[PDB]
Design an enzyme around this catalytic site. Structure first.
Site, PDB file in Angstrom:
ATOM      1  N   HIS A 164     -35.705  16.809 102.360  1.00  0.00           N
ATOM      2  CA  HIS A 164     -36.727  17.888 101.854  1.00  0.00           C
ATOM      3  C   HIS A 164     -36.504  17.792 100.117  1.00  0.00           C
ATOM      4  CE1 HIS A 164     -38.680  21.380 101.020  1.00  0.00           C
ATOM      5  NE2 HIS A 164     -37.714  22.245 101.375  1.00  0.00           N
ATOM      6  N   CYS A 166     -45.135  25.937 102.798  1.00  0.00           N
ATOM      7  CA  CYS A 166     -45.119  27.421 102.290  1.00  0.00           C
ATOM      8  C   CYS A 166     -45.063  27.119 100.681  1.00  0.00           C
ATOM      9  CB  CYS A 166     -43.673  27.746 102.666  1.00  0.00           C
ATOM     10  SG  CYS A 166     -43.453  28.199 104.334  1.00  0.00           S
ATOM     11  N   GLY A 182     -42.999  29.583  99.151  1.00  0.00           N
ATOM     12  CA  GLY A 182     -42.031  30.529  99.289  1.00  0.00           C
ATOM     13  C   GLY A 182     -42.180  31.073 100.496  1.00  0.00           C
TER      14      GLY A 182
END
Lengths: 396, 396
Positions: free
Chosen positions: A348, A380, A382
């Site tokens: 990630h 996303c 956040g």
């Protein structure tokens, strides 16, 4: 439903001519532990230019998603990168204005700027590195789990609140590694990946080994349902999230070369992809970490399309809880998502995620043929936001 | 033109029942130098509740804009604040996902959430303090000019590129202090301001003086065109920006209590304002720091209104260069803007700016009578964005 939406509609105007990434290496002692950030972003920016024979001064804007870099360090690492990739003083380099983000809006805002006619060629990119160049242009651990700790308690909430469990979460992780391994073994990443010729210091002796990194070093092909359900919960006591069914922070870069369609035609440049639409949504705050599931149908509808029209999906697998929910809530065929593995296997890279996933999608679309016509990149911005991008397969 | 827009349309549904702020004090040695952040935000949150006799558990969401707080420190200072203001465990406290912002989107996203029906009562707030509580819940200098250094070179660019100069920039600064002084002397801030009873250590002896702060301590009533054009340029060599025609970082908090109109009616609560519309725009990257001038007509149009319909304007005066451009480009009557002074006089509380300006606007609208029907709060969300909010005068 969304509290609000930003929709960007690009028509047929905005095309992608190149999309590349470095391999991703685990930030903790992984193969980029002795490579500085600009040495990751620089070959990716250089690859766009070389693939297209473009004068770097023609690029109108470079926007980089990056989370790990504290304060001013964000921009100076990117400016370094662009300088060493051969971009002049006049090519502006920007970072995305978010404390925490996966950088998909960087590609979207480059596209928007082209659509509105502000410039004809732009680059949307992303970078994450746990290392720090002592040579500055002209804390990082904190910023990472600062984005990940809130992200991890939300997806675990969504798991308890929606009934997602260790079972599906682990199955998703097994699948991720299976598909990443199969992709790697079959050479499906060869096209998108730009090898990084760096150095690696050996912990035992301290010598610098010349190294070319070509493979994502976080893939664990020996993962099954068995060994995963042996690691203890990472956050909560009876929490279903593990180090196994969540992705760990990886070093790496990605970059996407975008231009107006007419300028690609006159330059004799094959179109990799067509950027159709982008939606960014604010979700119900009482159910955070479900961003992708609101953004996907919002972006797909704006494309004037249906969910079933979409051939491929690149949905971020930061947390399996989060990832399984969104797939199941939208009733997506799991055969169509992250077909070559995801974040849980290949790592990630936080702000490089958006550009990483665009490269993976479009090249797999390129490889699958004309029938692989529509793709979705979703993630996303956040916990309280979802972003999704609709792409059509380019015609070569 | 905008590269993209987010438009929130609230109808007549979303009402404001209370809007308050602390005084603002200059961060460098100013009157809040010994007050911790939660001691600024806590009385403001408490004031909303007390003014409305509301059970704090009824509040559905608190969203706080805050820039200075590094990483996780953002949320923990706000959680402290909410705890000491008497909010229970169950009232969620969020920060705005931006590296740099003035916090106007916090109010907008609270409003959006009410509009979409996610909850019936919310608070949009903002906080900035250069101090740090040693008692943590359960670097700051860097983050400040990290937002201000890019902001200062852009508005100076816009000044050279558009022909704004020391002259108008200084005149704007003189006017700001004149209007802030006149406001203070006339007691026009009494309604919006919540006095902060704190302590102040004397540098000479080190004793703690009990103090109640009631006045903005950055107002310099003796400012004229004369003394301003004596300070050297702050950024560039022949740059027109000064410490005089730019705002300095101030400590302070603001908070806005928002609810659905029907719930205010049944609670017997006077409406201060009606939140009409919010627009957020991405601007041309080659001309950054002009955000407000694209956002204002975008939000005003979405209100189904014309520029001339707007009675009052609260436009951030972080830089006079920036501020004068936007006023002149849009042909706004300078008699209608920041009528009670702005950031250059009363201080620039970064993420508390949005809530600060809403309080100032609505109370001045309250005081001016029915004919003061429409107001605009506008500011940047970093250099590349503009945000504007349209408010109608509430009926009491």
């Amino acid at each position: 439903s969304a509290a609000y939406q930003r929709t960007s509609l690009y028509g047929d105007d905005v095309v992608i001519v190149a999309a590349h990434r470095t391999p991703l290496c685990k930030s903790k002692r992984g193969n980029f532990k002795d490579t500085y950030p600009d040495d990751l972003l620089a070959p990716v920016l250089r690859a766009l230019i070389e693939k297209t024979n473009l004068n770097p001064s023609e690029v109108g804007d470079i926007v980089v998603g990056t989370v790990l870099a504290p304060g001013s360090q964000r921009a100076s690492e990117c400016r370094m990168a662009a300088f060493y990739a051969g971009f002049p003083e006049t090519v502006a380099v920007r970072t995305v204005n978010r404390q925490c983000s996966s950088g998909l809006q960087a590609v979207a805002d480059v596209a928007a700027a082209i659509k509105a006619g502000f410039y004809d060629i732009g680059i949307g990119a992303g970078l994450e590195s746990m290392t720090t160049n002592p040579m500055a242009w002209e804390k990082k651990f904190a910023q990472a789990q600062n984005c990940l700790l809130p992200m991890g308690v939300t997806s675990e909430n969504v798991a308890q609140r929606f009934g997602v469990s260790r079972q599906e979460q682990d199955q998703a992780a097994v699948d991720s590694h299976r598909k990443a391994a199969a992709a790697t073994a079959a050479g499906k990443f060869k096209d998108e990946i730009i090898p990084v010729k760096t150095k690696l210091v050996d912990p035992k002796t301290g010598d610098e080994k010349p190294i070319t990194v070509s493979v994502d070093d976080g893939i664990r092909p020996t993962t099954t349902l068995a060994s995963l359900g042996k690691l203890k919960p990472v956050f909560k006591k009876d929490g279903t999230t593990t180090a196994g069914n969540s992705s760990q922070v990886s070093d790496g870069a990605g970059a996407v070369l975008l231009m107006k369609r007419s300028v690609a035609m006159q330059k004799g440049l094959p179109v990799l992809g067509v950027f159709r639409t982008f939606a960014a949504v604010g979700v119900d705050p009482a159910i955070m970490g479900i961003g992708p599931a609101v953004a996907i149908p919002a972006a797909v509808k704006a494309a004037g399309l249906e969910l079933d029209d979409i051939d491929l999906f690149e949905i971020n697998e930061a947390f399996a809880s989060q990832f399984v929910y969104c797939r199941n809530k939208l009733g997506l065929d799991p055969e169509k998502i992250n077909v070559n593995g995801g974040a849980m296997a290949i790592g990630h890279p936080l702000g490089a995620t958006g550009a990483r996933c665009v490269a993976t999608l479009l090249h797999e679309m390129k490889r699958r043929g004309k029938d692989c016509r529509f793709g979705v990149v979703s993630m996303c911005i956040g916990t309280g936001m979802g972003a999704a991008a609709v792409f059509e397969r380019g015609d070569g």
